[PDB]
């Protein structure tokens, strides 16, 4: 039950979120066909957001290395306790 | 009122998302604009983008290995060759092609769909009146008028890879700023607008139109005040050019109350407490970004530029100083005195200006 | 692969909306799909959407602090030793 609100904390599943309503504003647009040009500027500003967001995950590696040395960490403890 | 505004959606979505510059998104923006293209393999590496409408054929040639622009080579249908599309820099003997940089400096097509507008305008208008022919004749003509009116103006073409006629001056440092773009615009007024042949002649001293049979319909020829950039902003009394000849009025929207920096500047009492500054404009003053210069009104070029001139040196500088926190200042239209100490008008040199300002600041300061 | 193929039919969509209807609509369709697939690889996958900052930079503290009681115990461990 925590899993989703961890996903909602971070900003990229917000960007999605709005992502996803300002397609659905344009749709709704051009069902209508009178397109709104704000609709299309906010999709195409969110869609930049994501991108830039995008970006900004990739720098991950971090998280994986600290999993890394945490193994050793935990390895080393159970070889000493061991010992 | 639906197509007008369909038109300023369709412009204000290619304006905003220009694409990025592969060979089919250049294809797709030519096509957008009625230009015949094809595609030619001229080598397992190479393909060339051919384009062509009326009077302009555009060759594009395109690295497949690079994913890169390697060249783009313009050729007129015209008895015309001599149409200058490369950027005018002194001192590099690379003359650099406006469409290869639109294409390879820059990270969207945005610069090089403007540069094609600009051609295709021309070539759309082109007939007996020949506009490539014109607009780079005009380029020597309107710098010999400035030789033969002793205005300290130079005259260049092509300037940061785009197509126009640049009015620069000499600034303060030595560094070459422009004051004005003239390039050639759609009339969307009136589609039955007149555009005729002027020549400067240097034996009257004046523009002449010597064929009155050579017009084209539905262009303007438009001057541009290139901004700096509010206290950037260029002002104009009211009653300056005929409210005809503006093209671009800046409508200050009724929602924020900008004044002119200028008419703030008489109503607020945030002055260097060394100045009464007295206002003696009998006009308002008008913000104004385009004008149209067209057939009869190129005399206008000289009086427009001194104005703008005389407006950085001496008014935005006399505003500048007189905002940062007795003797009687009195500012009009054409004139600014300082007492009995000093004056300056728009008649006078650019020296007495910058003589007027060096003396009105040891006086502030 | 979603992300390209939404830009290029957003470009499309921004170049030729003089297209018939039947093109309008169909594109539109196709975007609809693109991030209605979207949304469902976000929804499946726990990991993406917790991908999707302070807590790194604690971590790495714990495990510097841990390193250094470790480095610690083991040096008293080889003095108290070597006798």
């Known amino acids: 039950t925590n899993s989703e609100d961890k996903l909602s904390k971070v900003q990229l599943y917000e960007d999605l979120c709005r992502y996803e309503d300002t397609l659905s504003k344009l749709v709704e647009s051009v069902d209508r066909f009178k397109p709104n040009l704000d609709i299309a500027k906010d999709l195409i500003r969110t869609d930049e957001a994501l991108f830039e967001n995008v970006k900004l995950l990739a720098e991950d590696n971090i998280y994986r290395n600290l999993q890394k040395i945490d193994k050793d960490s935990e390895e080393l403890d159970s070889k000493t306790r061991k010992i | 009122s639906y197509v007008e505004t369909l038109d300023s959606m369709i412009e204000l979505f290619k304006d905003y998302k220009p694409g990025s510059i592969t060979l089919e998104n250049i294809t797709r923006l030519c096509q957008t604009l009625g230009l015949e293209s094809f595609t030619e393999e001229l080598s397992n590496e190479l393909s060339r983008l051919s384009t062509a409408s009326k009077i302009i054929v555009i060759d594009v040639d395109y690295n497949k290995k690079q994913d890169r622009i390697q060249d783009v080579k313009l050729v007129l249908a015209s008895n015309f060759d001599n149409f200058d599309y490369f950027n005018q820099r002194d001192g590099e003997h690379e003359k650099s092609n406006i469409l290869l940089n639109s294409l390879t400096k820059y990270p969207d097509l945005k610069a090089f769909h403007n540069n094609l507008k600009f051609l295709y305008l021309l070539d759309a208008y082109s007939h007996k009146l020949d506009l490539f022919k014109y607009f780079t004749e005009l380029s020597h003509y309107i710098r010999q008028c400035f030789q033969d009116n002793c205005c300290d103006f130079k005259v260049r073409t092509n300037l940061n890879d785009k197509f126009g006629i640049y009015i620069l001056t000499q600034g303060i440092n030595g560094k070459e700023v422009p004051l004005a773009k003239i390039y050639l615009e759609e009339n969307k007024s009136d589609s039955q607008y007149r555009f005729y042949e002027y020549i400067y002649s240097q034996e009257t001293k004046s523009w002449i139109n010597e064929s009155a049979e050579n017009f084209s319909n539905g262009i303007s020829l438009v001057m541009e005040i290139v901004a700096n950039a509010y206290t950037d902003l260029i002002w104009f009394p009211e009653d300056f050019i005929s409210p005809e000849l503006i093209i671009d009025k800046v409508t200050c929207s009724s929602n924020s109350s900008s004044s002119p920096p200028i008419i703030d500047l008489f109503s607020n009492n945030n002055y260097n407490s060394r100045i009464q500054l007295m206002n003696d404009f009998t006009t308002k003053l008008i913000n104004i970004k385009k004008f149209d210069i067209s057939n009869d009104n190129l005399d206008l070029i000289s009086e427009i530029l001194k104005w703008v001139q005389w407006s950085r040196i001496v008014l935005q500088n006399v505003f500048k100083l007189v905002s940062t926190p007795v003797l009687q200042l009195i500012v009009s239209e054409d004139h600014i005195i300082l007492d009995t100490i000093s004056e300056c008008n728009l008649y006078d040199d650019v020296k007495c200006w910058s003589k007027f300002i060096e003396k009105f600041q040891d006086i502030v300061s | ?83």
């Open chain 3, 1 to 83: 692969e979603f992300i390209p193929h939404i830009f290029y039919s957003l470009h499309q969509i921004r170049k030729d909306p003089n297209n018939l209807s039947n093109q309008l609509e169909t594109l539109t369709g196709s975007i609809r799909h693109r991030l209605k697939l979207c949304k469902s690889l976000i929804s499946e996958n726990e990991d993406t959407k917790d991908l999707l900052p302070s807590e790194w930079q604690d971590i790495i503290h714990q495990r510097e602090q841990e390193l250094q009681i470790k480095r610690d115990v083991l040096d008293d461990l080889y003095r108290k030793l070597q006798r």
